[PDB]
Amino acid sequence: SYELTQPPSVSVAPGKTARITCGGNNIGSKSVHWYQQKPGQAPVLVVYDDSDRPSGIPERFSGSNSGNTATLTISRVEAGDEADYYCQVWDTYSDYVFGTGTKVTVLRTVAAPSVFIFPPSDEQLKSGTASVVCLLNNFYPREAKVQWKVDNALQSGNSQESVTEQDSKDSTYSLSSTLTLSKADYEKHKVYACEVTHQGLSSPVTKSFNRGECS
């Protein structure tokens, strides 16, 4: 078969120029197509046959392709161009092949997350479950580790998390981590602790409560 390689993400300052590469063997001999996908929308063809844009696609988007690398260039990146970008080719033997996609990230200064811990509500506890929530608010860049601790036991596999997209005003992320425990297990331990590591904190920040004390 035939494979297309792309970097996971590119970071560019507003007004500055983003370059997204698409690796492939003799990709120089193929017509490379580029698709922009904003979140919860269909992909949009921005660059076809290496360097051609359709009507209504800004001047800012241009393409280039030779040897084993083709390049989508996005000049004067505004917040609006935060998207996934997919290269794609028609192989004689593999039909249509997509690259893995590159996320375009707007670059801003480092911001430390503000950290909040929420105990299970009394309402949830009555219904036989406990969710403990850890909120990391308005941080940059995206990379963050949350380690959960219960009576100093490090929690592994029993948590899930999701991240918003870059805010279009301040360019930050927020992340929520939910620790799931049975009500019987929540009531066996006292100290519930969320530990946050990020480039913006010189040492990691712990938010804790003790079960059934004003938190």
Binding site: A42, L45, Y48, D49, Y86, Y96, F98, S121, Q124, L135
Partner: protein
Amino acid sequence: QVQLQQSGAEVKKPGSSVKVSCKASTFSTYSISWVRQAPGQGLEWMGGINYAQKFQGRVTITTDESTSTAYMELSSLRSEDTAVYYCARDTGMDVWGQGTTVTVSSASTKGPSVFPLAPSSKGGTAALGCLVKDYFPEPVTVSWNSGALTSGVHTFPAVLQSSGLYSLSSVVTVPSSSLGTQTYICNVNHKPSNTKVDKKVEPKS
């Protein structure tokens, strides 16, 4: 001005098969390709009327010139088939359908429970929210104070739990002095179960 209109969203049991349709607005000159995207994953070519050997067998792709409609049947569905299914016209692919959500699950329709995430008892800014927990299928909408409160709101993307049910949190940052004076209400809608809830979120004693 060709446009491709896809058939509605579908919840499918493991083992079953789904037929997705794609109606054009002279489609006898172009080829239609089917492309899928699992949630958070890349675009992946399926086939056109030619099958990707990852799906040779399980996929059936047909066209009816008479009604300029393209069809895609995917059989013996697994969770891993959960995806948006797009149709596109080949040139490159220039015209895209809006996409068909296929959710492969054993779960039954269920409205969420809405739990408060009460603002910490201990100037500056306090965080508070709603946990919207154990619903099927997607989506739910959340707003704050019937749309009056948008500043500092974050509604996280839903997460599928091991139980096969979704949950999500909505949070807002507010001034600490507004606690007990300002009423903070999250508005939760889950249309598939006809569950509507306005939940008051309040400091614990």
